[PDB]
UniProtKB/Swiss-Prot annotation:
Additional comment: Binds 3 calcium ions via the second, third and fourth EF-hands. Phenothiazine FD44 binds to frq2 and disrupts interaction of frq2 with ric8a. This leads to reduction of synapse number to normal levels and restoration of normal learning performance in a Drosophila model of fragile X syndrome, suggesting that the interaction interface may be a suitable target for the treatment of fragile X and other synaptopathies.
UniProt keyword annotation of Glycoprotein present: no
GO molecular function terms attached to this record: calcium ion binding; calcium sensitive guanylate cyclase activator activity
Biological processes per GO annotation: chemical synaptic transmission; neuromuscular junction development; neurotransmitter secretion; regulation of neurotransmitter secretion; regulation of signal transduction; vesicle-mediated transport
Binding site for Ca(2+) 2: D107, D109, D111, Y113, E118
Name of the protein this chain belongs to: Frequenin-2
Cellular-component GO terms for this entry: cytoplasm; synaptic vesicle
Residue intervals of the EF-hand domain: 27-52, 58-93, 94-129, 141-176
């Protein structure tokens, strides 16, 4: 099939754009096909992998958010090239590259801004995956602590974060990106 074989044109673009050598890309493709013989990873297949790694909670909500960022062309599947591009940024990117990737995750509706509700949505997704925790203080909930972090980053108090607000906000308070292991 087209999707199953690794074409030289794909390798050329990947070595131009990513931190991986041709040798590493070919190695990763062998592994990609062992887990995904079709060369196309579906959303549910993506969720299944996240369940292999967090068997206690429910990673479905978080995995679906991450999937949308991986699937950069929005065709409903992660092809090998999209897999490598995301892995390059998240495992080998510099701080600015990782913070932009985090911004794309938090900006669920892709409108150029993070809202409070979008920030809640990611945070809730993480707790579902990792283990929800009870709060007996209505003034010390995740939603409220997130509000404080958000307010500190929202320099012009318009109730939304630009990429610049989020990136310079995260370099003084990296907690929203360390929650994704991208600090
Ligand atoms: O989702 C994946 C990709 C995938 C993978 C498969 C094989 C080899 C390396 C990675 C995987 C990794 C860990 C658990 C489940 C799947 N990685 C990322 N996780 C996060 C989390 C937060 C923010 C950014 C990222 S990028
Ligand atoms: Ca795709
Ligand atoms: Ca948004
Ligand atoms: Ca703002
Ligand atoms: Na996408």
């Amino acid at each position: 099939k087209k999707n199953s074989k690794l074409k030289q044109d794909t390798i050329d673009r990947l070595t131009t754009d990513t931190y991986f050598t041709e040798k590493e890309i070919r190695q990763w493709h062998k592994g990609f096909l062992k887990d995904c013989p079709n060369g196309l990873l579906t959303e549910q297949g993506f969720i299944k992998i996240y369940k292999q790694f967090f068997p206690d909670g429910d990673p479905s909500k978080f995995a679906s958010l991450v999937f949308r960022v991986f699937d950069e062309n929005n065709d409903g599947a992660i092809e090998f090239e999209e897999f490598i591009r995301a892995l390059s940024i998240t495992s080998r990117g510099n701080l600015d590259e990782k913070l932009h990737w985090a911004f794309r995750l938090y900006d669920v509706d892709n409108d150029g801004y993070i809202t409070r509700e979008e920030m809640y949505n990611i945070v809730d997704a993480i707790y579902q995956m990792v283990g929800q925790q009870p709060q007996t203080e209505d003034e010390n909930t995740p939603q409220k602590r997130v509000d404080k972090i958000f307010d500190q980053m929202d320099k012009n108090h318009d109730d939304r974060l630009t990429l610049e607000e989020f990136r310079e906000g995260s370099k003084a308070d990296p907690r929203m990106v360390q929650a994704l292991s991208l600090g």
